[PDB]
Amino acid sequence: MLNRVVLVGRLTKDPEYRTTPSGVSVATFTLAVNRTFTNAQGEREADFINCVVFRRQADNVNNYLSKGSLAGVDGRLQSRNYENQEGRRVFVTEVVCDSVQFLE
Amino acid sequence: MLNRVVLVGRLTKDPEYRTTPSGVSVATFTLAVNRTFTNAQGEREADFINCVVFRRQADNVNNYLSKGSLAGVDGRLQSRNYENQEGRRVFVTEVVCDSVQFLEP
16 A cells, blocks of 8 residues: 655764664664744654664665765655563554655 | 645544543543555554544544544654653653544534
8 A cells, every 4th residue: 555755854873784683684873854844932843753664775784874965765654562671562664765856 | 844644544442532621621542543555464553643633623522532443643643751659750752743634424
């Protein structure tokens, strides 16, 4: 079914490498996406969105992007959950990127 | 900055509609959005996305959608933090819907 997210934001930190539970390698980063609008009174505010990149694109991400870099992503929203090390069930929704555009 | 989400799925439950203490219609629901292709064994998978809608759109969602209804949403991906009753920080990601399209007649 139709599932599309497109964002432009700035990386909060340098990108990382991780593996998924089944051992598949990804790149990860979090985009700070400033709001186009403003909170009642003109105050600047962002959403912080976790992005995941599969296949060789992950290497492009980890080399071209760093903390503060502007990036665009086009992908699908995916949900999952897990139990953290304190035994707490954590729910996430992340953007699984079909492409990443390097804007600087 | 650019932040756009568009989904089509089916509600998992009836929507939760309420009017907040300061008079605002708000409705919540979770959209089950089937994935494109299937796992190793040909089994169907879905993503379960938490959606929120306000004001007139919320009123309409409450009037027309129920458990299992097919709907489309156009909105923005929003993050927030809260502290739960145990003092634990919970990170929340939800879609704030600008418009909801009712796909079943």
